[PDB]
Every structure is written in C-alpha cells, then in structure tokens.
Amino acid sequence: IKMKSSDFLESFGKVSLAFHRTQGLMIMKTVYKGPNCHNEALLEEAKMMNRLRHSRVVKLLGVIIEEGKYSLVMEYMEKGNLMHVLKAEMSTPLSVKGRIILEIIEGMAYLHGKGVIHKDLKPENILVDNDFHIKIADLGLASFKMWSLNGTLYYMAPEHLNDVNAKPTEKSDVYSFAVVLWAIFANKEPYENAIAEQQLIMAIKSGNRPDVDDITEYCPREIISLMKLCWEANPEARPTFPGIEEKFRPFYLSQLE
Amino acid sequence: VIKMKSSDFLESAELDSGGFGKVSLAFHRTQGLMIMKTVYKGPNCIEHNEALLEEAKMMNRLRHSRVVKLLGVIIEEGKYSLVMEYMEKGNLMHVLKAEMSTPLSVKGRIILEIIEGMAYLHGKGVIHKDLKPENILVDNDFHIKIADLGLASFKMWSKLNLYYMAPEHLNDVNAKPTEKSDVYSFAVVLWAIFANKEPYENAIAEQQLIMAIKSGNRPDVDDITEYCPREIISLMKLCWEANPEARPTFPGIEEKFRPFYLSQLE
Ligand SMILES: CN1C(=O)[C@@H](NC(=O)c2nnc(Cc3ccccc3)[nH]2)COc2ccc(C#CC3CCOCC3)cc21
Numbered sequence: 277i278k279m280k281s282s283d284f285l286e287s288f289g290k291v292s293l294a295f296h297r298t299q300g301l302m303i304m305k306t307v308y309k310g311p312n313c314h315n316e317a318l319l320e321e322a323k324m325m326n327r328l329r330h331s332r333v334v335k336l337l338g339v340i341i342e343e344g345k346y347s348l349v350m351e352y353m354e355k356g357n358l359m360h361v362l363k364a365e366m367s368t369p370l371s372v373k374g375r376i377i378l379e380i381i382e383g384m385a386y387l388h389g390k391g392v393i394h395k396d397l398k399p400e401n402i403l404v405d406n407d408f409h410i411k412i413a414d415l416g417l418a419s420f421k422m423w424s425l426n427g428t429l430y431y432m433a434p435e436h437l438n439d440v441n442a443k444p445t446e447k448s449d450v451y452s453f454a455v456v457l458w459a460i461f462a463n464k465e466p467y468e469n470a471i472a473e474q475q476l477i478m479a480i481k482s483g484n485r486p487d488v489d490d491i492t493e494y495c496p497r498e499i500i501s502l503m504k505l506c507w508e509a510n511p512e513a514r515p516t517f518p519g520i521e522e523k524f525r526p527f528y529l530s531q532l533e
Numbered sequence: 534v535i536k537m538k539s540s541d542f543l544e545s546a547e548l549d550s551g552g553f554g555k556v557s558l559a560f561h562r563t564q565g566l567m568i569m570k571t572v573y574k575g576p577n578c579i580e581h582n583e584a585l586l587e588e589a590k591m592m593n594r595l596r597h598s599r600v601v602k603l604l605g606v607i608i609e610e611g612k613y614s615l616v617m618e619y620m621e622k623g624n625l626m627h628v629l630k631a632e633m634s635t636p637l638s639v640k641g642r643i644i645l646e647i648i649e650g651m652a653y654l655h656g657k658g659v660i661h662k663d664l665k666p667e668n669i670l671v672d673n674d675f676h677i678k679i680a681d682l683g684l685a686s687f688k689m690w691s692k693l694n695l696y697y698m699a700p701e702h703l704n705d706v707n708a709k710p711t712e713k714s715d716v717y718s719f720a721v722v723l724w725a726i727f728a729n730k731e732p733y734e735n736a737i738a739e740q741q742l743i744m745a746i747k748s749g750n751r752p753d754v755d756d757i758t759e760y761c762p763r764e765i766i767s768l769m770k771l772c773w774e775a776n777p778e779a780r781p782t783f784p785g786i787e788e789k790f791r792p793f794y795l796s797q798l799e
C-alpha cells in the first residue's frame with residue numbers, strides 16, 4: 277500500500293485529484309511538515325484501513341510517505357456526499373433513498389463485523405458515486421489515529437455529549453444512523469430552530485430529538501419507527517446493525533425497491 | 534545575544550519542530566550545532582531592525598536555568614532568524630513516548646523544574662499563554678527548559694512573522710490569559726507526564742471537546758496506567774479547577790511539591 281509521488285502523472289482541509297500512472301483517478305490528502313523518524317506506525321495504520329474492503333466502504337488505496345510529505349490516497353467518488361445529493365434540485369425518489377439506507381446498513385454491518393466503530397457517522401461521511409450508490413468514509417480521520425499530523429454534533433449519541441472520556445460503542449453509530457435517517461427524509465440538517473449549541477446539547481442529553489413533523493415528504497411509518505428506536509436514550513435499547521438489516525431488507529424489497 | 538550571519542552556518546537539515554512550523558538543525562562554523570527558525574523572508578524592512586534586536590535582547594534578560602535563551606539572531610536584508618540551543622532529546626512529549634521508560638524520580642524532577650521555570654517567568658511578569666509538552670525541551674541529562682516556540686511572548690518577531698487551554702479561554706477569541714491560565718496548562722502537563730500521552734483520546738469533535746471541558750470534563754485520571762502518587766493526582770485536580778481564583782500560584786505549587794519530591798520521589 278506504499279505509493280510514490282512519481283507514481284502520479286498529474287493533479288476537511290486541502291485535498292486534490294490525482295491521476296495515477298496505472299491505477300486510475302484518485303483523491304489525495306497531504307500533510308507537509310518537517311520529517312518523521314513513526315513512519316512505520318503510520319504505515320501499519322494505513323494497511324489496517326486498507327484491509328477494510330467492502331462495496332459500501334471507501335477504499336484507502338495507498339499512502340505517500342516521503343521526507344516531509346505524508347499523504348493519504350483514496351478512491352474517487354463522483355457525486356460528493358449525501359447532504360449534497362439530498363439538497364440537489366433534482367429530488368431523490370423514495371426507492372433510491374430506501375436503497376441508500378440499505379447500503380448504509382450494509383456498510384455499517386461490515387464495519388462492526390470487523391470490530392471497527394466509526395464514531396463520526398454523518399451525511400458528510402456518506403459519499404456517493406454516479407449511480408447514487410454510497411460508501412462510508414472517515415474524512416475527519418476519527419479512525420486514522422496517527423494520521424489525524426494536522427452543526428458538527430447533531431449526529432452524536434448523547435452519552436458522548438459533554439462526556440469525552442466515555443468510550444464509543446457500536447450503539448454510538450446506531451444513534452448517528454437514526455439522525456441520518458431523519459436527514460435523508462427531511463433533506464436538511466436537524467435542529468434548525470435551536471437556541472445555541474450549549475443549550476441544544478443539554479436538551480439532547482435530556483431527550484430532545486429531531487422534529488419528526490419537519491419531515492414534509494412522505495416517510496414510511498417503518499422508517500419513522502426505526503429512527504425513533506435507533507435514537508433511544510438508553511444505548512442498550514437501540515438495535516444492532518445486523519438486527520436492523522434483518523428487518524429493513526424484507527421491508528425494502530417488499531415495499532420500496 | 535550574538536548578531537549571527539547566515540554565512541556563519543555551513544549547512545542545515547530540517548527537523549520536526551513539534552507543531553511550530555519549519556525549523557532546522559544548523560551547524561555554526563565555530564560554535565557547532567544549533568536550532569534555527571527563519572521567521573521572515575521578504576523585501577527589505579530595515580525600520581524594524583533595532584526593535585527586533587531590542588526585543589531579542591529583552592527576552593534574553595529572562596535568565597534562568599529552566600528557561601530557553603536565544604543564542605543569536607540573524608538580521609539581514611530580507612532575512613530574519615532566531616537561533617537557540619539544540620536540545621538533543623526534543624520536547625517532553627517526544628521523551629515521554631520513547632521506548633525507554635522514564636523513572637518516577639526523573640518525572641518528579643522534571644515536574645519540579647517546570648515549576649521553577651514557571652515561577653521564574655511569573656515573577657518577571659511573563660504569562661506564557663501556551664504552556665504544553667511541546668514547549669518543554671529536554672537536554673541529554675533530562676533537565677528541561679521552557680520555550681516559547683509559538684512566539685506568543687515575542688511581540689515584534691511575531692508581528693514581523695486546546696488540550697492545555699484553561700476552559701475560560703475555550704471558545705473565546707478575546708481571551709486574556711493570566712498566571713492562573715498557565716497553572717491550568719501545568720495541570721494537564723502533569724497528567725501527560727504520568728499518562729505518557731496526550732489527553733482526551735476519545736474526543737471525536739473539537740466542539741464536543743471544547744463544550745465538554747467547559748462543562749467540567751478533565752483528562753481521565755483513571756486512565757493513568759503506571760503508578761502516579763496520590764499527592765500528584767491531588768495536585769493536578771487543584772490546578773485544573775474551573776474557578777481560576779481557586780488554582781494555586783507557582784510559588785504555592787512549589788512550596789507543596791518540593792518537600793514532597795525530596796521525601797518520596799528523589
Ligand atoms: C484522501 N482521503 C482519504 O484517504 C480519507 N480516507 C477515508 O476517509 C477512508 N479511508 N478508508 C475508509 C473506510 C472507513 C474505515 C473506518 C471507518 C469509516 C470508514 N475511509 C481520509 O482523508 C481524507 C479526508 C478528506 C477527503 C476528501 C474530500 C472531498 C472530495 C471527495 O468527496 C468528499 C470531499 C479525502 C481524504
């Protein structure tokens with residue numbers, strides 16, 4: 277998974293498009309600094325993320341590790357992120373939204389099956405290709421411990437609000453997924469009427485959630501019930517992603533596909 | 534301070550400054566290895582020269598065994614640099630994370646030396662404003678010196694140019710640091726010295742971490758693995774109190790810690 281700057285013919289911070297000599301078009305995020313000693317650790321972390329190989333999970337394709345040049349290289353994603361897609365003038369039909377949801381469940385079930393907690397799932401981290409299929413990404417480097425060399429709380433489980441030393445769990449991601457479901461059908465971010473972030477945090481910790489009545493589109497009653505289950509205050513009362521899939525897939529095929 | 538010339542230096546190699554931009558290990562043609570930080574590279578600005586020189590001379594009146602000194606400045610047509618001693622072991626975080634562990638007796642002495650350097654700086658009316666492990670440099674005998682690598686105390690040279698920040702400065706860009714701000718930074722440095730790592734590894738978002746610390750979250754005391762004396766745990770909680778007025782002074786910290794250090798850790 278080691279790449280060289282010379283492997284490239286041509287060209288959340290500063291990124292660029294990269295034309296690889298033999299492996300196609302890519303996206304590069306680069307850190308320019310005085311050199312490391314360290315590099316072996318960054319590489320073991322990159323080979324770990326590169327082991328995450330699933331159709332609904334962004335592929336880290338390589339890294340550049342050169343004296344003073346440290347770069348992550350991931351696959352190209354044509355259509356931006358889910359919020360960009362949801363705000364687009366051409367509205368996204370119910371069948372496509374339902375398939376988007378199913379693909380998010382598939383990617384998250386893969387990640388959890390691999391022992392990986394995302395910890396920052398949100399629409400900005402759900403990237404979309406040309407046919408509206410999605411891939412889950414970690415553009416904030418919340419899982420790239422070493423490489424992380426360098427509005428945001430609406431999807432965060434309340435057990436992490438004002439509690440930064442508590443350890444995230446799979447149920448942390450299930451809460452984020454609940455609010456993503458709301459955004460998918462509201463076509464916007466939640467809590468547009470909140471007073472200030474400090475008050476909002478305390479409100480969410482005490483049980484406030486996105487306003488379901490601000491969903492104006494038709495939203496199947498199953499998805500409404502699913503989002504409320506996945507954002508229960510008690511983490512234990514939220515389902516697992518395999519549990520969600522096993523109910524949601526029959527519903528998707530029977531009713532949405 | 535010596536008025537050095539770029540020609541005094543034979544060659545140089547880039548180093549990791551630990552978050553403070555590009556610096557290099559330079560070899561002085563008669564004085565050997567030093568650390569150079571080029572601050573200005575542009576057109577002629579002779580008007581500032583006497584001031585930059587005086588600022589460097591003023592800062593070099595901070596003379597204490599635990600406080601970094603400038604070795605020289607380079608003041609030339611369009612090029613301006615600072616030059617300081619090469620602390621072979623890097624900063625405190627680099628030392629804490631090395632393979633060879635650091636014995637408790639040395640950690641106690643490092644803490645004592647940080648207290649001495651800060652008490653000196655505060656006695657001279659200097660507020661550091663950016664005290665953190667990356668600003669604590671370590672020589673080969675594991676003695677430390679406090680540095681100002683961010684230039685927060687270099688007015689003219691900075692013009693010509695969150696983990697450790699007290700909660701009363703978080704989300705406050707009109708923040709006016711005080712001595713008690715530095716004491717808070719010291720408390721987190723104390724935790725880091727015994728945790729051998731940076732605090733808050735489970736924080737996900739900056740606004741999460743900022744609002745959490747403002748509401749009273751602190752480095753995870755239970756997350757210290759190696760033995761940390763109960764006195765020092767008590768010391769850090771005292772120094773990272775929410776009320777700045779409740780925090781002790783550095784002479785006050787010293788009066789507690791030095792007797793403890795000599796009887797237990799030395
Ligand atoms: C180049 N680059 C990357 O390699 C990023 N890597 C991942 O995210 C990632 N790699 N493996 C997974 C799977 C995964 C594993 C575990 C949990 C979750 C997911 N994720 C990190 O650094 C970036 C930040 C930002 C942009 C960008 C950009 C813009 C252009 C493209 O559209 C979006 C905006 C690109 C990158």
Ligand SMILES: CN1C(=O)[C@@H](NC(=O)c2nnc(Cc3ccccc3)[nH]2)COc2ccc(C#CC3CCOCC3)cc21
Binds near residue numbers: 592622624
């Ligand atoms: C060369 N150089 C300096 O002269 C720096 N000078 C001070 O900091 C300093 N000078 N007088 C005091 C006293 C003082 C005053 C007020 C409060 C506290 C102290 N302070 C500023 O510009 C730098 C930035 C960064 C690096 C570096 C580096 C790394 C290289 C590898 O090893 C680790 C360090 C080096 C420098």
